[PDB]
């Protein structure tokens, strides 16, 4: 990606001068965007889960692996050995493509993208984005599951400090309030 080269030059230079980073790889590096749109309705309407996968596929270009619970719960009618939830982890070229497509196409189509930040880092440098609805994503036709759901896009980084993670976020211009 040309914007990937833009990431290379800009992240290196700005971060290094901003904190006098003694090595080019001291600057933070983003690792993996996991997506997990999981629903327990597969316990009863299994068909539903199947359609989910294709949409998830259609969202990332990597086919989603359906995850299984490690316990069994009666109130949720849950039992071990069943598929409740798909997870996709993008790397290499595809991960930056999806991130860029999200921030530039998907996110500003959000009904009210006012943003949420500072109160989202997990304390280790990560970041989770809770999408509310799927139809807003352009790579989705109106025909979809009878139920509509959101997404749990998350982020990872090489650094372990959340503040330095915020610095990468600001350098990448991830659009949140003051962050």
């Amino acid at each position: 990606n040309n914007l990937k080269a833009h990431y290379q030059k800009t992240i290196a230079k700005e971060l290094q001068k901003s904190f006098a980073f003694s090595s080019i790889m001291q600057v933070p590096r983003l690792e993996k965007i996991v997506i997990n749109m999981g629903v327990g309705d597969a316990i009863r309407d299994s068909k539903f889960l199947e359609s989910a996968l294709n949409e998830l596929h259609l969202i990332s270009g990597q086919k989603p692996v359906a995850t299984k619970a490690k316990n069994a719960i009666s109130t949720y009618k849950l039992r071990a050995g069943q598929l409740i939830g798909c997870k996709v982890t993008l790397r290499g070229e595809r991960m930056w493509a999806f991130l860029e497509k999200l921030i530039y196409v998907a996110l500003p189509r959000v009904r009210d993208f006012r943003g949420l930040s500072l109160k989202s880092f997990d304390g280790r440098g990560n970041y989770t984005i809770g999408i509310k609805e799927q139809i807003i994503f352009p790579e989705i036709v109106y025909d979809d599951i009878k139920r509509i759901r959101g997404f749990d896009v998350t982020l990872v980084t090489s650094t372990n400090k959340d503040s330095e993670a915020l610095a990468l976020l600001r350098a990448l211009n991830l659009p949140l309030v003051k962050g």
Binding site: K101, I103, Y104, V105, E139, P175
Partner: peptide, 21 residues
Amino acid sequence: IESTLKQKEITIDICGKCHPF
């Protein structure tokens, strides 16, 4: 951007630059 859609000019009505934020 890489995607699994029509290989033509899909027009977006609100892009990043067309946003008040």
